[PDB]
Amino acid sequence: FNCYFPLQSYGFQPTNGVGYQPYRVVVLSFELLHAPATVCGPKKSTNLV
Amino acid sequence: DIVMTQSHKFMSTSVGHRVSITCKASQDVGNDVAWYQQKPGQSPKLLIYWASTRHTGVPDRFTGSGSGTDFTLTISNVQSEDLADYFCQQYNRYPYTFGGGTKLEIKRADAAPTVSIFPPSSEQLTSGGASVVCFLNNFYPKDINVKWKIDGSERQNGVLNSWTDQDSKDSTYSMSSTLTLTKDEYERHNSYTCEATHKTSTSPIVKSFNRNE
Amino acid sequence: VQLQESGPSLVKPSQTLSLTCSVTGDSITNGYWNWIRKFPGNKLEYMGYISYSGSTYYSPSLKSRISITRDTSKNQHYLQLNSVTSEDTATYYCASDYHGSKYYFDYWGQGTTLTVSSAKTTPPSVYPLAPGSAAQTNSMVTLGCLVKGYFPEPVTVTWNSGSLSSGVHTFPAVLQSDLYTLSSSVTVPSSTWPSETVTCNVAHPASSTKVDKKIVPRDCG
Amino acid sequence: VFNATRFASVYAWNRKRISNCVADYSVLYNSASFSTFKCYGVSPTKLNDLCFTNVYADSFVIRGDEVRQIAPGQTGKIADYNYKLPDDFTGCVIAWN
């Protein structure tokens, strides 16, 4: 009584289709500024003779 | 939205010819590119998922490839019953953005069209309309450059074209061309000329009549 | 499993939209059944979807004037759009958005063409195409008829009330600037024409109007 | 970060700091195992030939009806209240079932 929950819970069921399926979202954020660019892969794949 | 813009709207593929339909995406969607199959008289169903795996119940003659942005469908040893519409879309997130689509046709021998003209009825002027249609039969290909000539003057606005499935008698197609006219344009003109441009000969089929008999 | 579309095809503007899609062969217990409308000219747009639990979600093209409902007792689902206009004039299709064995499957239905405009109900007037003196005759005779001045969609078109089936090529209805129209043709050989009478019968199921028009070999006796 | 045992919500997410390693995106772009693949700002081909400063990995689980709001220039219950991307977002969104 008089105890509302605005933080509603999600719903994940195996019988649901692709609409309510759990997506492991990994956001790949990128940003350029006055700081020097460090983490995008310092080296690459080359060849040699 | 990521619109799957196709490169070709139609392709003439014979029985056993390799189909090559290329759809160019404006944004990279990874590998979530699917295809539809809209048969005339049947329901559109999903055919290829992940651009390489076919649908269940479908034989292994439908396959393909693609990576990143250049997706090209590859149908080896196609048949005459596979004449359907192939659409390019995405299924990564909502909403599903659809493209234009590519309609296939069976590559057959060339044939001269048979233009059959018909006079309009006198009851259309009483109701307040006008409709004159020219039919073509036993022709090749489907995209016949047929233009209307209204009293010697060419007209392309208001031309309503429609197409159907191929005939099982001699592997030919059929089409129609309905011209919509108003009340003032029907009384000022009397002659209607339908000319179909083909590739079998240099002399086109010219059909004309007079509406006052 | 084959999907079947139904519902009204004449909805006035500023009203409540209502469609009905029936699913035969599978109950609403797994997967999704979405709504995709089709504009004339190979243009498709996503509308919404709903699961079997009751929760739904809308497309970002519309802000808040679309609600999607479901029904697990009759295995059907409805579509509701408020404050419709001329932009909603499209052919609504119903699909099956479900997955299985780490893959996705989808199949559409027949579709129901809906027209939202200021046009009123008009009974059809069938105009047959009789051959004149300038007509071309051969072993294969082509006849036809024209439909113009009817509202709303859809209609049925046959030949001799279903008795003539050789060479029947029916064309779909194309929208003009004011109303709808169709076209139909049939190529019959010399063994049937003019031995058999070709009658073009076009019926209107939305208004229960059936106009019978015959084709005569002019000039006949 | 995709096969993690534990994670967090969409508003109290744990930012996995990625630093001092080579970010090989060949096993994530053309692996044919991720369903949702959204990219904004720039092309993903420039994400392997141009160096960037800060790359963070926000690992959370959200449904498909609210996964469309993780984009620059969107609105809803997540893009305005839970998780919002900046307008100069030149990255990609990768998710799987």
DSSP chain B: ---EEES-SEEEE-TTPPEEEEEEESS--TT-EEEEEB-TTS--EE-EETTTEEPTTS-TTEEEEEETTEEEEEE-S--GGG--EE-EEE-SSSS--B---EEEEE-------EEE--PPPTHHHHHT--EEEEEEEEES-S--EEEEEETTEEE-TTEEEEE-PPPTTTS-EEEEEEEE--HHHHHS--EEEEEEE-SS-SS-EEEEEETT-
Residue C57 to residue B123, Cβ atoms within 8 A: no
Residue B31 to residue D43, Cβ atoms within 8 A: no
Minimal Cα–Cα distance from A12 to chain D, Å? Answer: 8
Chain B positions contacting chain D at CB under 8 Å are 27-32, 50, 52, 67-68, 91-95
Which ranges constitute the DSSP H helices of D30-74?
none
DSSP code, position D77: T
**Cβ–Cβ < 8 Å for A21, A10:** no
CA distance B76 to B128: 53
Minimal Cα–Cα distance from D65 to chain C, Å? Answer: 6
Nearest to B113 by CA among B174, B167, B177: B174
Sorted by sequence, the CB contacts under 8 Å of residue A19 that are 6+ apart come out as: C32, C49, C51, C57, C97, D63, D64, D65
Nearest to B98 by CA among B109, B113, B85, B88: B88
Write the Ramachandran bin of C75: left for phi over 0, alpha for psi from -120 to 50, otherwise beta: left
**Cβ–Cβ < 8 Å for B90, B1:** no
Chain A positions contacting chain C at CB under 8 Å are 11, 13, 15-21
Contacts of C48 in chain A (CB under 8 A): none
**Cβ–Cβ < 8 Å for B23, B51:** no
Sorted by sequence, the CB contacts under 8 Å of residue C124 that are 6+ apart come out as: C147, C149, C150, C155, C202, C204, C209, C211
CB-CB: which of B30, B32, B91 is closest to D29? B30
Sorted by sequence, the CB contacts under 8 Å of residue C162 that are 6+ apart come out as: none
Three-state DSSP class for A42?
Answer: coil
The amino acid that residue A33 corresponds to is L
Nearest to C94 by CA among C6, C195, C196: C6
Sorted by sequence, the CB contacts under 8 Å of residue C67 that are 6+ apart come out as: C56, C58, C80, C81, C82
CA distance B114 to B136: 5
For the sheet with B173-180, list strands across it: B114-116, B131-139, B173-180, B159-163
Cβ atoms within 10 Å, residue D40: 17
Residue holding tokens 């052919």? C91
Which H or E element spans position D68? none
Three-state DSSP class for D45?
Answer: helix
Q: Which of residues 58-77 of C touch D (CB under 8 A)?
A: 60
**With the C-alpha atoms ordered B30, D34, C93, C13, is the resulting torsion angle positive or negative?**
negative
Subunits with 3+ Cβ pairs within 8 Å of B are C, D
CA distance D18 to D12: 18
CA distance D25 to D29: 6
Minimal Cα–Cα distance from B122 to chain C, Å? Answer: 9
**Cβ–Cβ < 8 Å for C33, C96:** yes
**Residue B134 token pair:** 């020219």
D27 and chain B in contact, CB less than 8 A: no
Subunits with 3+ Cβ pairs within 8 Å of D are A, B, C
C57 and chain D in contact, CB less than 8 A: yes
**Residue C129 token pair:** 């195409």
For an interface test with B, the pick among C68, C178, C183, C186 (most B C-beta atoms closer than 10 Å) comes out as C183
**Residue C189 token pair:** 């050989």
Write the Ramachandran bin of A3: left for phi over 0, alpha for psi from -120 to 50, otherwise beta: beta
Three-state DSSP class for D93?
Answer: strand
CA distance A30 to B130: 63
**Residue C122 token pair:** 């008009």
**Cβ–Cβ < 8 Å for D64, B53:** no
**Residue B147 token pair:** 């233009």
Cβ atoms within 10 Å, residue A23: 23
DSSP code, position D88: T
The amino acid that residue B35 corresponds to is W
CA distance C188 to C197: 11
CA distance D78 to D93: 15
> Buried (b) or exposed (e) across D54-84, using 16+ Cβ within 10 A?
bbbbbbbbbbbbbbbbbbeeeeeebbeebbb
**Cβ–Cβ < 8 Å for C47, C59:** yes
**Residue D3 token pair:** 């096969």
Nearest to B196 by CA among B120, B113, B85, B106: B113
Cβ atoms within 10 Å, residue D14: 14
Question: Taking chain C, what is the end-to-end CA distance rounded to the nearest angstrom?
Answer: 54
- On the 0-12 / 13-18 / 19+ scale of CB atoms within 10 A, C73 is exposed
Cβ atoms within 10 Å, residue D88: 11
Structure solved via: cryo-EM
Residue B176 to residue C103, Cβ atoms within 8 A: no
Q: Pick the residue from chain A with its C-alpha nearest to D50.
A: A40
Contacts of C52 in chain A (CB under 8 A): 15
CA distance C61 to C58: 8
For an interface test with C, the pick among A8, A15, A21, A23 (most C C-beta atoms closer than 10 Å) comes out as A15
Minimal Cα–Cα distance from C50 to chain A, Å? Answer: 8
Which H or E element spans position D29? helix D26-29
For an interface test with A, the pick among D16, D53, D61, D68 (most A C-beta atoms closer than 10 Å) comes out as D53
**Residue B27 token pair:** 């944004």
CB-CB: which of D65, D74, D97 is closest to C57? D65
HEC profile of chain C: CEEEEECCCECCCCCECCEEEEEECCCCCCCECCEEEEECCCEEEEEEEECCCCCEEECCCCCCCEEEEEECCCCEEEEEEECCCHHHCCEEEECCEEEECCEEECECCCCEECECCCCCCECCCEEEECCCCCCCCCCEEEEEEEEEEEECCCCEEEEHHHCCCCCEEECCCEECCCCEEEEEEEEEECCCCCCCCEEEEEEECCCCEEEEEEECCCCCC
**Residue B167 token pair:** 């005939």
Residue holding tokens 């002399």? B203
DSSP code, position D47: G
Cβ atoms within 10 Å, residue B159: 14
